[PDB]
């Protein structure tokens, strides 16, 4: 049997990501003594933007208190950021947009973004075009804090990480239908290579288990168990329901 | 004096003393590299019963070897052939891990000639050893009349041809009814003497 394409995207040869023009990793600022006892001032220098992927970045320049030098950084821009806006950053930080302050101190029901799942890893959650997490509760003993994610799920995070305040700028992107075809083509000429999907019934039976036959039909049930071999795991992966609920 | 009963200490391996000294030394050894030189042998008892005189020339390394069998280096399954020769998981290697350790520490330092090896510690996934190496051309080894047999060019790489005591077990030889099939030189010429036709002149 020939190797189906799902058993062929895990090589790393032609399905790599186009990382030439990407201006840099949208990290956060690290931890130190100042971000644990006070705050520190940023001087946003421009809003240089990568529509390499579709979310706007931010150039934030900090005064570094160890050597005589100016550390640059990058962030993800919240909604309503100027050009020239004193972004503060720390734990004693006052509460408005652009500032970044720990999770344990902000009150309940505050719309945040770019949370750190662990008390320091420089930003890993809710950073896409137009999403926001909400802080649900707190707990003074055991030092934890609940939060609801934009999926719908909930999760417990220790109340020592950090988060910017405000939603991600770039919302409303899922509208304006791509009525053209090659305008999705110039979208996936960027990041990576998977766009012209060929359905499985059209294929021959040597590269897809569903295919083959005279009539375009499946024969086998599309729903498959998870404890399955690689290359059979092609259909609906696991089911709790399969239908018409709206 | 002591060497008679350091010997009898180093077979209290279940006791609380040696369960401490190994629950320490295996950790110390685990943060080091895979093949490094120690200046003196951890066991002098066992070291002297193999030929380690404490003079100039003799060197002692210390190497780690990972553990387990050997599964066959094929793609996914796909061992083409009859269904006897499908087996990939549960195969077992013929030579021991002790003469793996000897020839890993016998090829990396090619200017030396291996004498023997011994045991030190064990983890879940690691077996440690010690080795003894000899300078062939140093004047102290050279002018000894007893042990200038090494410098002869015959005894190059004793460990690749299988001559150490760790490979002598793998060859399968001795005397008796238990060792029929290595009469002659080895296992091969015990095959060659048999599966040939001696065609005489007159017959």
């Amino acid at each position: 049997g020939r190797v189906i394409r799902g058993q062929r995207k895990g090589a790393g040869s032609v399905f790599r990501a186009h990382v030439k023009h990407r201006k840099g990793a949208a990290r956060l600022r690290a931890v130190d003594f100042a971000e644990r006892h006070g705050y520190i001032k940023g001087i946003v220098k421009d809003i240089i933007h990568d529509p390499g992927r579709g979310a706007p970045l931010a150039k934030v320049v900090f005064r570094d208190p160890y050597r005589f030098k100016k550390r640059t950084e990058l962030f993800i821009a919240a909604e309503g950021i100027h050009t020239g806006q004193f972004v503060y950053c720390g734990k004693k930080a006052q509460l408005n947009i652009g500032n970044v302050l720990p999770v344990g101190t902000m009150p309940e029901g505050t719309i945040v973004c770019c949370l750190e799942e662990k008390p320091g890893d420089r930003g890993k959650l809710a950073r896409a075009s137009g999403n926001y997490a909400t802080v649900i509760s707190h707990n003074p003993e055991t030092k934890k804090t609940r939060v609801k994610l934009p999926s719908g799920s909930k999760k417990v995070i220790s109340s020592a990480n950090r988060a910017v305040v405000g939603v991600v700028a770039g919302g409303g992107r899922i509208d304006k239908p791509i009525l053209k075809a090659g305008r999705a083509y110039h979208k996936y000429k960027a990041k990576r290579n998977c766009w012209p999907r060929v359905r499985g019934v059209a294929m021959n039976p040597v590269e897809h288990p569903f295919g083959g036959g005279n009539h375009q039909h499946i024969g086998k049930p599309s729903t498959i168990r998870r404890d399955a071999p690689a290359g059979r795991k092609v259909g609906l992966i696991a089911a709790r329901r399969t239908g018409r609920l709206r | 004096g002591a060497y008679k009963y350091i010997q009898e200490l180093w077979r209290k391996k279940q006791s609380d003393v040696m369960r401490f000294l190994l629950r320490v030394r295996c950790w110390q050894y685990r943060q080091l590299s895979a093949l490094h030189r120690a200046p003196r042998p951890t066991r002098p008892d066992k070291a002297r019963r193999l030929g380690y005189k404490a003079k100039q020339g003799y060197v002692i390394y210390r190497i780690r070897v990972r553990r387990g069998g050997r599964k066959r280096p094929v793609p996914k399954g796909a061992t083409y052939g009859k269904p006897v020769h499908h087996g990939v998981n549960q195969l077992k290697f013929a030579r021991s891990l002790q003469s793996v350790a000897e020839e890993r520490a016998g090829r990396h330092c090619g200017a030396l000639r291996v004498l023997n090896s011994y045991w030190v510690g064990e983890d879940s996934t690691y077996k440690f050893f010690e080795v003894i190496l000899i300078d062939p051309f140093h004047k102290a080894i050279r002018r000894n009349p007893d042990t200038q047999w090494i410098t002869k060019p015959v005894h190059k790489h004793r460990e690749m041809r299988g001559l150490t005591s760790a490979g002598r077990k793998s060859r399968g030889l001795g005397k008796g009814h238990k060792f029929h099939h290595t009469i002659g030189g080895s296992r091969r010429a015990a095959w060659r003497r048999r599966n040939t036709l001696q065609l005489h002149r007159y017959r």
Partner: protein, 53 residues
Amino acid sequence: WRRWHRRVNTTQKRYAICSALAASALPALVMSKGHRIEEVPELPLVVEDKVEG
């Protein structure tokens, strides 16, 4: 390894020697073999021991 050589028994090798010595004494089986023996005075020709000198 074609079988080159042969072996013959012992007591046939000695019977052929006795049957080749018994016919170097007749003056007919020597003339008919081809030699020139018209004049030799005695067929088992025995000469003195000073020829080894």
